Structure 1
Amino acid sequence: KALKVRTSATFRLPKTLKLARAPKYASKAVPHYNRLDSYKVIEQPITSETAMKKVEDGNILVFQVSMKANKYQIKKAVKELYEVDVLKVNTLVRPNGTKKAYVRLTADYDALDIANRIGYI
């Protein structure tokens, strides 16, 4: 009779094969479409007098955006919907529960012309 040598007095659970799931059927079988596309991210512009004076003074577009949108998604949506390059995004949750995004554009883009192209002012 032979016996194996054990340097440790502790027995550990041996490593056995862990198979990846190979399901017989799909879990839902229709993937959900994008829950946050650019249209869902950007709800509408904000057109108060303060937001507008920010538009022609700070190169800033003020938007009401989805409460589920983070600064990355807001940056990506603005670039896609309006084809402007974004310098910075500041966000806040307004006292009415909506989210406001201050989206400052680069020096290469104006905020007046974009606001005009979108439609307000």
Structure 2
Amino acid sequence: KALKVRTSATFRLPKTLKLARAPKYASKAVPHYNRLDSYKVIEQPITSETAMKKVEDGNILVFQVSMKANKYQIKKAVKELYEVDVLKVNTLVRPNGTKKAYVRLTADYDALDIANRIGYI
């Protein structure tokens, strides 16, 4: 009978229906537990005499953190374990290969009070 009207001398691949994966079995069937826990992002504070100066003076806490953690996780974890809001986070990689975090607490909180509450002063 009649033909389809083509207004373009270029032929393109037709759009076909794409299915959604419906696997017969799960990939691993046991989801991995949270790899980067709040107890794993921060492990131990730093007690160098220079670090203690920042705690008493600048209202700044110091922690050693896992190299896989970023500032979002560090800020999230500190306010979790210590129930204290965080002003800002500074991070650097120490020459020995570990990550050092400079956490500054809000003026409503005292770093020195938190520090000895943890157990070091």
Q: TM-score range by the shorter chain?
A: over 0.9
Tell me, in whole angstroms, the C-alpha distance in 1 between the residues paired with 2:43 and 2:11.
60
Superposition TM-score, scaled by structure 1 size: 0.99
1: CA distance, partners of 2:82 / 2:97:
25
For the pair 1:46 / 2:49, whether they are aligned, the reply is no
Is it true that 1:100 corresponds to 2:106 in the alignment?
no
Q: Deviations over 1:78-98 (max 9, x none)?
A: 000111100000000000110
TM-score by length of structure 2 reads: 0.99
Give the match's secondary structure for 2:30.
coil
- Deviation at residue 46 of structure 1 after TM alignment: 0.6
5+ residue gaps in structure 1?
Answer: none
Residue 83 in structure 1 maps to residue 117 in structure 2:
no
Distance in 1 between residues matched to 2:53 and 2:90, nearest whole Å? 17
Gaps of 5+ in 2: none
Q: Deviations over 1:57-81 (max 9, x none)?
A: 0000000001000000000000001
Q: What is the CA–CA distance in structure 2 between the aligned matches of 1:9 and 1:50, rounded to whole Å? A: 75
CA drift of 1:43 comes to 1.4
What secondary structure, in the 3-state scheme, does the structure 2 residue paired with 1:36 have? coil
State the SS of the aligned residue for 2:78.
Answer: helix
| Percent identity over paired residues | 100
- Tell me the C-alpha RMSD between the 2 structures: 0.5
CA distance in 2, matches of 1:44, 1:15: 56
Regions of 4+ moved over 2 Å: none
- In the alignment of these two chains, the number of paired residues is 121
